[PDB]
Design a binder for this molecule. Structure first.
Ligand SMILES: *[C@](O)(C(N)=O)[C@H](C[C@@H]1CCNC1=O)NC(=O)[C@@H]1[C@@H]2[C@H](CN1C(=O)[C@@H](NC(=O)NC(C)(C)C)C(C)(C)C)C2(C)C
Ligand SMILES: *[C@](O)(C(N)=O)[C@H](C[C@@H]1CCNC1=O)NC(=O)[C@@H]1[C@@H]2[C@H](CN1C(=O)[C@@H](NC(=O)NC(C)(C)C)C(C)(C)C)C2(C)C
Ligand SMILES: [Cl-]
Lengths: 306, 306
């Protein structure tokens, strides 16, 4: 028993982290086979960042201008190209610790593990969700750029996120590993609005199932609701619409607990309308929306990797 | 900016996890040099667990009775001994991935990372605190026994916790790596009372400093208090006494923010007496006590390892 925010084991990603320096800018790179991937603003001075011409800047750079370090060892750069917002540095050494890997573009509402790094050295690991407005609520200081987000499916690392920038109120934005931003952001230090964030309804329901599995049952009411009536109430509280796809995805937790999804929806409607009256669910005074149905099953069934 | 519950990177511990089986009981072991450490109840059937005679049970066991697997590879056991509540299995192969390591006995109020494992395979990593009543609030299913808790100081893994058992309400108890239980527990399936838990005052103050560093300043009041007057108020709310040692340990956060510890104590006294009035601190509706002053500094200064 017990329910914790749990990250994937980071060992397979730790072996891929390097330091990339170009003049006075140092940040992190991801070393897979004979390529290092890093944010392209490594080639910027502080002033460049206000309105960078990345092509004019990369044009003046030679391979030797990129100092890449894996622990002590300097890796020699033998080629460089820009793909959208990421630099690819070809190196003369293939990483011997390259795991099986994929580049994936994750969907809003899905979770991943972040391995926070400084100067190419891992600092810590934590789980976060891609918010409906394509930001994440991370922990990132100066030096963390190039830190990556990932999921593990048995032996395969799916890299989904590379860190680029911070937005108002300690929210974070970055790219997939093809250098395409999540959301309407550009890698320039100029005013840009994030859309308003919403609550990930399917994830709150997954977490209420986790609560029941753990014996926290006080919020279960005797009622049911229709999908349409549930969605009308939750829209008022800035919850995303629940879809039949979501109902189908909650199927395993529904079957394990014997609680129909629409019955759990009636219990959530009452929490939204009446609040929690000073009670906690799984130790929390607020409704949690950063556990997916698959995260709840994985954690409540003991799914392992490697 | 941003503040997350962050675990240590787990790579150095992942390389040490093995599976240990003796008849029908399988759980996890820690493989360091040519020794595997695991909970001694691996030698128990379900019935044995009600009142085990570990010596009578281990007496009937030969080296071959222990099946140890590191991934696919079977490791041959060449010796076995019991030290308090842990079995030490001598194996004919020293682990090539053994990191620099220490066995430490952590103090109540200190945090560590748990690498949750099933069948010798890592499942996930999360941070937790040794509670004042010598339990932890973990996430552990059947099969998780032998999972370890650790801290990393640059290159050195300090192993502090090995998982043995679950207590009423999904709280967890285990041993140091010399097999001595934290708290008044024995490895028997019979009634045992945990002492009442308390709130780790020094950790709540550390977290209020993290909030200020992140710009969440609404709870700062214009007052100060004495250590004695603070302790009289907090004792009512089941907070542990704050000591001068604690005041000294909060020194770095106090100096960084320019807020005297006793001024922050006056702000905590007002939160305890009046509550939060529906406001959040760092996204939480409750006061958090599982970040140490060192965890706040580490996370807010970007301390790395390896
Ligand atoms: C990254 O470059 C690194 N070296 O770590 C850094 C990471 C930042 C620093 C603070 N926390 C982080 O996550 N990224 C940047 O400095 C990027 C970089 C330049 C500005 N920038 C920002 O993150 C800024 N944000 C920003 O301007 N936000 C807007 C106004 C667009 C909403 C700032 C102010 C430094 C946090 C570029 C190329 C985007
Ligand atoms: C561990 O053996 C494993 N194989 O994973 C297992 C871990 C447990 C199972 C559920 N969650 C966990 O953390 N440990 C045990 O089964 C230990 C073992 C036998 C009983 N036991 C327990 O944890 C029990 N707890 C218990 O009896 N609690 C008291 C009454 C002492 C407060 C139980 C009921 C199975 C959870 C021994 C030797 C202690
Ligand atoms: Cl909360």
């Amino acid at each position: 028993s017990g329910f914790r925010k749990m990250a994937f084991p980071s060992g397979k990603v730790e072996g891929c982290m390097v330091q990339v320096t170009c003049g006075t800018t140092t940040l992190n790179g991801l070393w897979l086979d004979d390529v290092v991937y890093c944010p392209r603003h490594v080639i910027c001075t502080s002033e460049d960042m206000l309105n960078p011409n990345y092509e004019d800047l990369l044009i003046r750079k030679s391979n030797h201008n990129f100092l890449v370090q894996a622990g002590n060892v300097q890796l020699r750069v033998i080629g460089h190209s820009m793909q959208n917002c990421v630099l690819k540095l070809k190196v003369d050494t293939a990483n011997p610790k390259t795991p099986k890997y994929k580049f994936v573009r994750i969907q809003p509402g899905q979770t991943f593990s972040v391995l926070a790094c400084y100067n190419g050295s891992p600092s810590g690991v934590y789980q976060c969700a891609m918010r409906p407005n394509f930001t994440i609520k991370g922990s990132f200081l100066n030096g963390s750029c190039g830190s990556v987000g990932f999921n593990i499916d048995y032996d395969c690392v799916s890299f989904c996120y590379m860190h680029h920038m911070e937005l108002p109120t300690g929210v974070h934005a970055g790219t997939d590993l093809e250098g395409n931003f999540y959301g309407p952001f550009v890698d320039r230090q100029t005013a840009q609005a994030a859309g308003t964030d919403t609550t990930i309804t399917v994830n709150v329901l997954a977490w209420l199932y986790a609560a029941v599995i753990n014996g926290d049952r006080w919020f279960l009411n005797r009622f049911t609701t229709t999908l349409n009536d549930f969605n009308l109430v939750a829209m008022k509280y800035n919850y995303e619409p629940l879809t039949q796809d979501h109902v189908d995805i909650l199927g395993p937790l529904s079957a394990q607990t014997g609680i129909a999804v629409l019955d759990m929806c009636a219990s959530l409607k009452e929490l939204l309308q009446n609040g929690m009256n000073g009670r906690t669910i799984l130790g929390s005074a607020l409704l949690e929306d950063e556990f997916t149905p698959f995260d709840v099953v994985r954690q409540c069934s003991g799914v392992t990797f490697q």
